[PDB]
Design a protein around this ligand. Structure first.
Ligand SMILES: *C(=O)[C@@H](NC(=O)OC(C)(C)C)C1CCCCC1
Length: 215
């Protein structure tokens, strides 16, 4: 039987979130990866705080964009990241208000998958769990997605502009794919998710900026 995994079935994925009017996709991607590792390492997870990252990761630009590795590094140096409940998302950057009392996860580093390698990415998803990735999500066809395995030849792998989360991989109707968790609400795509073409020459640059935190 062909290799495939869907971490949503295993309880490694929390409900789909909505960024609102803030370019915080990176924060949600990071938090999603941390959540997956919490489930993996401790047997249970909870919603982590993307707001904590938006406000405290000085190396990023808050609602103006950021990198997942920068967030992981921050969680590590900071000795922690608050839970969503302790540090709720307001969708706008504010002053860093982290509080150790509400710490909900820790990080011991991170690893970046070899750029452009879907085979290494697949191994990471299979051996680590959900991984943070970035893609070109500017196409109109990406935005109005609803079903099937998305693939658009004009998707620019050299223009990563949206962080997302690879929650698994498989095949649907002879079409190999990556299971992708977005942060545009459950209203977007298929209940907040999108099936993206796998092994279609790094479509949309799916393997160009992938990483996972070490816990
Ligand atoms: C989306 O939420 C943001 N994307 C982002 O941080 O992209 C990386 C650096 C490729 C992960 C941006 C922030 C504002 C401009 C548009 C989308």
């Amino acid at each position: 039987a062909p290799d495939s995994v869907d971490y949503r079935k295993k309880g490694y994925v929390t409900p789909v979130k909505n960024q609102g009017q803030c370019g915080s996709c990176w924060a949600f991607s990071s938090v999603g990866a941390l959540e997956g590792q919490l489930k993996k390492k401790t047997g249970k997870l909870l919603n982590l705080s993307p707001q904590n990252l938006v406000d405290c990761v000085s190396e990023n630009d808050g609602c103006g964009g950021g990198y997942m590795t920068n967030a992981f590094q921050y969680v590590q140096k900071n000795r922690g990241i608050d839970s969503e409940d302790a540090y709720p998302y307001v969708g706008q950057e504010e002053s860093c208000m982290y509080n150790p009392t509400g710490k909900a996860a820790k990080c011991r580093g991170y690893r970046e998958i070899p750029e452009g390698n879907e085979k290494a990415l697949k191994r990471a998803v299979a051996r680590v769990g959900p991984v943070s990735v970035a893609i070109d999500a500017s196409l109109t066809s990406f935005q109005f997605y609803s079903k099937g395995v998305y693939y658009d030849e004009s998707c620019n792998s050299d223009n990563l502009n949206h962080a997302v989360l690879a929650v698994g991989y498989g095949i649907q109707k002879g079409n190999k794919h990556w299971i992708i968790k977005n942060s545009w609400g459950e209203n977007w795509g298929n209940k907040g998710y999108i099936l993206m073409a796998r092994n279609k020459n790094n479509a949309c640059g799916i393997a160009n900026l992938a990483s996972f935190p070490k816990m």
